[PDB]
C-alpha cells in the first residue's frame, strides 16, 4: 500500500553563489534522509539497497524540490538556506545555461500546471524508487514499490483534476528534463571540486566518492 | 558511505 | 488526431564495431526522416521547426529503435547494416559499461514487458515532439501534438492490455533512461570525432555540428 | 544543415 497522505506528510516534514549553492545542497542531504524515511516502506528495504537508492537519486531530488520551492520567485531559485540565486547571478558565475534550463523545464513548467506538493512528493517517491540502480540486491521489490507509487499519484490526479485526463502524463514526463539536469549539474560539481577552490563540506563529498 | 549509513540506522 | 493505425504504419514503412556502428547510425538517419513525414502533423509544422525536432531527438529515436530491433538478440544488437554487435565486442572496443546499460535498461526491460510496435512508435513520437527543445517557434504547438500521442497511446494500452492499469506509466518511465543513454552515447560520439580514427559519413557528422 | 533541410524538403 502507498497512500498519497502518507507522501505528502513525508513531503510537508522536511520543510559566489556557487559556494552558497554548494551549501544548501549539503544542508538538504541531511533533511533529504529524513524524507526518505517517511516514505511508506522505504526503511523495511535493506540497509545497502536505501543507501544505493539515495545516492543514485539524491540529486534528482534536490533539484525537484528546490525547482517546486522557487515556483513564487522570479527569474530565480530560491535555496534551502534562505538564499536567493537569480539569473544575472547565475550568469556572472559561469554558470548561465544551466540555470536557465532548471528555470524553463522545471520551474516555469511546475509554475504552468500547478504542480500540487502530493505530486511533487509522488514524483520524487518514484526518483527514489529507482530500479534501474546498479547493485540493488532485489530491484523487483523496488520497481514494485514504484508501481505502487504511480498506481497512487494517477488516482489522485483524476480525483483532483477530472477534466485533466493529460496531467499524470505531464507529470512523469517531467522526470527525463530533470534526469538530463541533474547530470549536467553532477557535472559542474566535479569541476568545482576538481579546480578545488569551492567549499564541498562532509555529506556532498561523501556522495561525490567513488563506487 | 559513513554518514549516509549513520543517518539511516539512526 | 493523432491515430496509433498511423503511428504504427510509420515504424512498419521503415523496417571495429564503433566504425560499424557509425555507418549503421549515418544510414538510419536517412529512414528516420522518412518516419517523422510519416506521424501525423509533423510535416505541417514549420521546416525551421522539423529541423529542430530531428536534431534535438535523433539520437534517442535511433537508440529507441535500435534497442527494440534487438529483443530477439541474445546478449547484443542488431544494427540497421544487418551487422549484430555483441557484449564480448562492445567491452573489446573499450565501451563495455554503455553498450551493458543499453541491453539492461532498453532491450531487456522491452523485452520483458514485449513492447509492441504500436508502442514504441507512440513513444518515438513522444519523444520527437519535444516542447523543451531549443529555438522552437512555436513551442505550444509541438507540446499539443505530444499530449495527442500520449493521450492515444493511453487508450491504445488500455484498450490491448485492460488488466495492466500500470502499462503505460511504465512505458513513459523507460523515457528518463533512454535520455541518459542518449546523452552517453553522444559523449562518446563526440570522442570519437575528437580522436580522427573512426569514419563518420555526413549526415551523422552534420548532426554533429554546432549550433 | 543542408542534408536534413533537403531530405524534408523532399
Ligand atoms: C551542489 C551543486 O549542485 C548544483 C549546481 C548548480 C545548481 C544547483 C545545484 C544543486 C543545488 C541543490 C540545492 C538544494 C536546495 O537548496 O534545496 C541541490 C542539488 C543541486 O544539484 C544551479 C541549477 C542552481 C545552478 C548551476 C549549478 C551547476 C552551479
Ligand atoms: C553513432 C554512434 O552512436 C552510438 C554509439 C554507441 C552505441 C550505439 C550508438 C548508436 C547507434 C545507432 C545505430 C542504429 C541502428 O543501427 O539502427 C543509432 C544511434 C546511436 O547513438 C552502442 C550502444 C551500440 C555501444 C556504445 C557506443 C557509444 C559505441
Given at each position: 500500500d502507498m497512500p498519497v497522505e502518507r507522501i505528502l506528510e513525508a513531503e510537508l516534514a522536511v520543510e559566489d553563489p556557487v559556494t552558497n549553492i554548494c551549501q544548501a545542497a549539503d544542508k538538504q542531504l541531511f533533511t533529504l534522509v529524513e524524507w526518505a524515511k517517511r516514505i511508506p516502506h522505504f526503511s523495511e528495504l535493506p540497509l545497502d539497497d536505501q543507501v544505493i537508492l539515495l545516492?543514485?537519486?539524491?540529486?534528482?531530488?534536490?533539484?525537484?524540490?528546490?525547482?517546486?520551492?522557487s515556483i513564487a520567485v522570479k527569474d530565480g531559485i530560491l535555496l534551502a538556506t534562505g538564499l536567493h540565486v537569480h539569473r544575472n547571478s547565475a550568469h556572472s558565475?559561469?554558470?548561465?545555461?544551466?540555470?536557465?534550463?532548471?528555470?524553463?523545464?522545471?520551474?516555469?513548467?511546475?509554475?504552468?500546471?500547478?504542480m500540487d506538493k502530493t505530486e511533487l512528493g509522488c514524483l520524487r517517491a518514484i526518483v527514489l524508487f529507482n530500479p534501474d540502480s546498479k547493485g540493488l540486491s532485489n530491484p523487483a521489490e523496488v520497481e514494485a514499490l514504484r508501481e505502487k507509487v504511480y498506481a497512487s499519484l494517477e488516482?489522485?490526479?483524476?480525483?483532483?483534476?477530472?477534466?485533466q485526463p493529460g496531467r499524470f502524463a505531464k507529470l512523469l514526463l517531467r522526470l527525463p528534463a530533470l534526469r538530463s539536469i541533474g547530470?549536467?549539474?553532477?557535472?559542474?560539481?566535479?569541476?568545482?571540486?576538481?579546480?578545488?577552490?569551492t567549499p564541498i563540506d562532509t555529506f556532498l563529498m561523501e556522495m561525490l566518492e567513488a563506487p | 558511505h559513513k554518514?549516509?549509513?549513520?543517518?539511516?540506522q539512526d
Open positions: 545516492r543514485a537519486g539524491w540529486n534528482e531530488l534536490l533539484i525537484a524540490s528546490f525547482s517546486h520551492r558565475a559561469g554558470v548561465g545555461a544551466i540555470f536557465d534550463r532548471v528555470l524553463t523545464e522545471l520551474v516555469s513548467k511546475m509554475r504552468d500546471m500547478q488516482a489522485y490526479c483524476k480525483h483532483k483534476y477530472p477534466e547530470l549536467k549539474c553532477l557535472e559542474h560539481l566535479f569541476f568545482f571540486k576538481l579546480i578545488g577552490d | 554518514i549516509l549509513h549513520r543517518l539511516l
